[PDB]
Amino acid sequence: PADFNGTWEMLSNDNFEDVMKALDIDFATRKIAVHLKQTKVIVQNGDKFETKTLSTFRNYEVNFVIGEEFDEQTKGLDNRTVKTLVKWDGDKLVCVQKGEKENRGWKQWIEGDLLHLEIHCQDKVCHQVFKKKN
Ligand SMILES: CC1=C(/C=C/C(C)=C/C=C/C(C)=C/CO)C(C)(C)CCC1
């Protein structure tokens, strides 16, 4: 079983601008955001997840239990309300965010000491990789 617990520092971030544009985040904001390093802080207790996404610009928090749908407010991103549901795919997390934007969600997994995060909206996909610090 994967263990997502820890602090993970971004190594790479590809096609983030494509996803931000699909979310209608304006160009000025995309330009700021694409150049920032991010940190992911995760506390996992079995199916219970507390996560934080940190940057010098804005921070983002999302907490969930596997299989339990909840209202997510993407404040600081696109600031939309979505119905979010995260489930397992083997050792991987797969999240669907039901709402105004079509085909919105993300997929997260570990290979070794690297955390991978795929973020998708409409036909766009962003791939991020993070290295475990603690
Ligand atoms: C666009 C946007 C940002 C991106 C955050 C992303 C999109 C987080 C994805 C969160 C998920 C998938 C949960 C943890 O895996 C941050 C807040 C850095 C700065 C302001 C603009």
Side-chain angles (χ1 to χ4, degrees), residues 113-125:
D113 68 353
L114 296 183
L115 179 69
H116 288 74
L117 175 65
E118 237 162 20
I119 309 164
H120 59 80
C121 182
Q122 300 176 168
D123 62 338
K124 307 302 191 186
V125 182

Side-chain angles (χ1 to χ4, degrees), residues 7-43:
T7 292
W8 312 79
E9 315 194 290
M10 167 173 280
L11 276 177
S12 66
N13 188 15
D14 301 320
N15 297 90
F16 194 35
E17 295 171 83
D18 285 349
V19 171
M20 288 187 290
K21 185 180 166 180
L23 296 168
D24 306 303
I25 299 178
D26 58 66
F27 178 53
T29 299
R30 304 191 311 250
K31 274 349 218 176
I32 293 315
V34 80
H35 287 302
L36 335 128
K37 284 292 211 191
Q38 304 180 21
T39 298
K40 249 67 156 102
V41 178
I42 306 170
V43 180

Side-chain angles (χ1 to χ4, degrees), residues 16 20 38 40 53 57-58 62 76-77 106 108 117 119:
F16 194 35
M20 288 187 290
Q38 304 180 21
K40 249 67 156 102
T53 301
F57 185 42
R58 290 170 190 164
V62 50
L77 268 52
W106 49 262
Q108 187 169 272
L117 175 65
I119 309 164

Side-chain angles (χ1 to χ4, degrees), residues 61-118:
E61 179 174 340
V62 50
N63 309 308
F64 60 88
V65 171
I66 293 285
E68 173 185 62
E69 186 175 75
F70 63 108
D71 278 18
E72 177 180 1
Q73 187 64 213
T74 57
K75 197 140 337 216
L77 268 52
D78 59 324
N79 200 16
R80 290 187 169 98
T81 308
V82 293
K83 309 281 201 186
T84 297
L85 180 57
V86 186
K87 296 161 56 117
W88 290 110
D89 179 356
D91 289 349
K92 307 191 177 189
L93 296 172
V94 175
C95 174
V96 170
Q97 290 165 139
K98 277 247 69 111
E100 170 70 16
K101 296 284 162 186
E102 288 163 21
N103 192 219
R104 186 189 185 149
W106 49 262
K107 185 165 193 168
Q108 187 169 272
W109 68 97
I110 294 170
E111 321 173 9
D113 68 353
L114 296 183
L115 179 69
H116 288 74
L117 175 65
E118 237 162 20

